[PDB]
Amino acid sequence: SRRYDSRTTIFSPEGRLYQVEYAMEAIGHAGTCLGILANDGVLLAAERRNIHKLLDEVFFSEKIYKLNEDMACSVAGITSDANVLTNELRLIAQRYLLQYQEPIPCEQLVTALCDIKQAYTQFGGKRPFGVSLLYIGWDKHYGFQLYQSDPSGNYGGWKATCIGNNSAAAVSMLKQDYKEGEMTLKSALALAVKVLNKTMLSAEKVEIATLTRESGKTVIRVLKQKEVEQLIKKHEEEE
Template identity: 50%
Template structure:
């Protein structure tokens, strides 16, 4: 049954998360089923508490149930201890619930993977991913959903340190030893928040199965600290901001493509010139 749940996730829209110096970025592909459907700013991203948000990939109804459970757990903890629940502890509670549904007959696993972005005073900015089996781990950057391998490869290219380690994609999936993979690469590149947002948009533009990427097909949110109060702040990027980012990235890719084609044309011209010179040299040699 877990395999069927993972299959549902593999067909879901791409969702990814990146930890930067100034915050955590959550980004997701939105699949618009009808132009008549009224859209919201966020469809796959939920706020669990003031310091934790989650981005989901898979069966939305299952995600809603888990989000409701996570919110209740976080609120009960704060009501009991008068402080926010540590991020990893909240992730563990939800993962335990998911794992329990794999142990009994008559129950099916939750068909959803969840990317948690959070901050607490002990561990700072954090990113966790959990799968339907209840496995979870900490990551610097990761991706779930359709075309996850392509996105993981791009994350590794941009974030791997000088040693070429696997700090971005580490293992083959969330069921592997993701916590070790995420924390053992001390030389991984740390991005600024702006760079992380740009990278998220660039990856989604590559993985979305459409030639026309618009802001309606993306949702991006960031978790940062308020510059004065130093409390976590969650904010979703507006359509206007996404349009600007998409246009900038498309223009940069067009410029790179034009430069590559120009370089290819120069190489072809250089090769033709060298071939012509060789022919003339051979003709001159045979004439003598």
């Protein structure tokens, strides 16, 4: 019984947690997910890794999920782990809204899911969740926001970020192209497309979602095939 034990939540000589570090390696071989914060909204531009000539479109999206009325997220890692994680995120948001009768703030939600991820890396003797998340939303305290989360249970707020396949190559491109404080949703979509192309595109090999505010109401919507197609053509004109 103690010989078959793999000891997942255990420290190592260097002081690192192997299991968590091995789960981070699996997130670097997943569909690239990028989020950009603007002034009138925040978007999620993830690449679709489920492409084939025999696959159905059925659902409304494949990587981008809706947590609640004003929040959304894009995962990157084990697909089945996200199904568990995103279902728990919806529960946390519903429990909070049932208690205070108000939408849960974005940072409180991300923090609650990170406490569950960190508990799997300290006790229980089970493998950690092999998934990284990107959250976009709007609350009355800080407005539009964009958070990132990894398998260790660590999180942080950003203006522009990227998780997945070419995170380091995409992050550098955003570093020298993000005009902090003077970014609009329209000009951010170009940035996404510009970075998404240089880090891999068709209108079926990607999926974009924007989150904006209209008449005291959050509006989350996935851009349509045609809607994205035009963006891709406009980036070709500048290239």
